[PDB]
Structure formats: structure tokens, C-alpha cells
Amino acid sequence: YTPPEGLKKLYASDFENSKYPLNIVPSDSVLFAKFLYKAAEEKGNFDNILSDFQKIAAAASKLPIFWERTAVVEKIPEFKQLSEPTFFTLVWMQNNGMLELIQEVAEVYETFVNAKQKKAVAKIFVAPGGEKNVEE
Amino acid sequence: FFKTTEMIGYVHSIDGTIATLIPAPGNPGVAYNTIIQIQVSPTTFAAGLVFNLEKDGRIGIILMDNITEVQSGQKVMATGQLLHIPVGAGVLGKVVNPLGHE
């Protein structure tokens, strides 16, 4: 793997102590989200990461059961189209064997993006098939 | 004019009569040694007591009632208050639980 210079420089910094939109308690799934947010903030584009997670979720639906334990993101073609920050993070997880936290790091990243963009999300819990009627 | 509760996270693990909670990102958080309600149904709740507050954000919960109804992934609401029970001369001659339920 040949990570870009920018990500290499950021990975060696104490970015964990930098300022963020929200003060979330430290956690394994939070460190990766902070790294993605910091990397995306430099470029100023955050929707690219969200698209990457969408592609990952779509790809995972076709991968064999327990793909996160035999995972090789480099060999997987679906992840070849991901952005450098997301691909670097996936390799970062695969090295530590924490690829099972993909669906939770994304949640944190979305929370940071929404806070930065000043968006408040309201969760509407409805019965199976009630998504049609979200009016009241 | 709504009976708005204070959701603080979800139920992660259950081991017998105790449980663990994972807080949802960007939520108020729960206080130590307080009572919480696990929404086993849209109208039914199970009582729990906060016992641990870990660095990871996970919360240790001591279940008190309706344990069989508790499942992983359920929602948790925080009352934000310690345990209070009925007291007075109107309880004499009765059999009650530690929670005050007759």
C-alpha cells in the first residue's frame, strides 16, 4: 500500500486531541471517525465519505458471511473505487482486525458532519412498512 | 406539551440480571446511580440502575423488573433522578417490593 502524503502526515499527528464539532467520549470506533473528519475537513468535502460508506454497505451485502475476518481490502475490487481517506481507514481497520466497526464509524462520522453543517436529524420509528406514512 | 423522555442509548449486552448500554452519539448522557427505563414495548418499561460509567461510554445496568422482556437493541430512557419510593402511614399493613410496588 502507498498512502498519500497528506494522510501519512495526519496519521502521525495528535489529531485525537484536536477540536471537533461535538465532544464524543473516546472509543475505538470514534478514533477512525475523527481521522476521517479531520482528513475531509482539510479538503472541505464531506459527502465523498458518505458516498464511500454507501458503496461499502452495498458491496458488503454481496460479500460472503464473515468477510471481515478474511478481509483484504486491497484485493477486494468493490473498495478500489473508494476515496483515499476511506480506503486508508479501511486498511487501518484491517490491520487491527476491526473491520466489523465499519457500520458504527459511519454513524459517528455522519454525526460530526451534521453538527458541522448544523443539521438536526429526527429519528421516526415506525412499524414494518409504515415508512409510507410519516406525516404526523 | 409532550411527555418527552430522555433517550440516552441502546441495550448492547445482557448477562442474566445485569445489562450493558451503548450511548447513541450526541446524546445528553446518564448520571451515576440513577434509574433508567428500558423500553421493552411502546408502553412497557423495565427498571434499571446505573452502576458503572466506563471510558468507552458503555454503561453498566442492574435490572430490577421485567428482565425476561429485555432484549439487545432496545431503547433506554433516562429519568435523571435517583430512586424514590412511596412512604407514609398509608403503606402499613402491606407487602411491597424495594421499588414500592405492592
Added chain:
Amino acid sequence: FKTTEMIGYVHSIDGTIATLIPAPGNPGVAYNTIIQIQVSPTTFAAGLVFNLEKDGRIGIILMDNITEVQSGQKVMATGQLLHIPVGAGVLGKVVNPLGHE
């Protein structure tokens, strides 16, 4: 014993117990089966599977040639439990728990 395929490599050895890290693709090993650790190209030591971890690591109880076992050696899977010779052809003989005379 008949070997089928490699199922990983020896990682740690603590006395008579050992651990195996999975081979590429994690072929998997049946629980409580017998595995053959290729101590030598022609010599295979016997191990019993006793633990299948979530990460893919296998817990092995070594039976013979424990000293010969070293980390990095390949492990093949028989895919079957332990079977030993039985009948009138064994009477009058001295054997070991693995059935070897």
C-alpha cells in the same frame, strides 16, 4: 491419518498446548477433530482441536512430538474425530492412546 487441506500455521506453543492462526481464506476446522502439524515434511505430529476462536485462531492440544513442534509449521486437517484400531488383531500388543504400536 488422511490429510485433506492446510488450515493454518502454528503460532504459539505453551508446553503441551498450542495455537493456530488461520490460513488464507480461513478454510475452517471441525471442533474436537484431529489435526496433523507438519513438524517435518514426512513427519506429522498429532493435535486435538479444543477451541475455535472468533478471530479464526484454533486451540490445539498436542499429543506427541511436542518438542518437534515449532511456530510457523503448517497444519493439515483430517476432518474426522479420533479413530483407533480395534479387534482381535490388537490383542497381545502394547499401544499408545493414538493407536500406535
Added chain:
Amino acid sequence: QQRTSSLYNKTRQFGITAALIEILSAMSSLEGNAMKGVRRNKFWEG
């Protein structure tokens, strides 16, 4: 004297075993509660 000596020698053996077991249980509890953090090393350069 031969019956109270056995119970005395049987008691010391049990006492040593139990105390050691307690300590190891605490050691395992503090090891289990511990969690390793993300490894901040140059994984790509491997």
C-alpha cells in the same frame, strides 16, 4: 494427636490454594477489563 495433625496439614494446603486462587481471579479480572487501543504504527510500511 494423629487426627488433629492431619487436619492441620490439610488446612494449610487448602489455605495456600484458596488465597492464591483469589489473587489470580483478581489478576484475570483486571486483565479482562483492560482493552488495547488502536495501534498507531506505520502499518502500510510493512
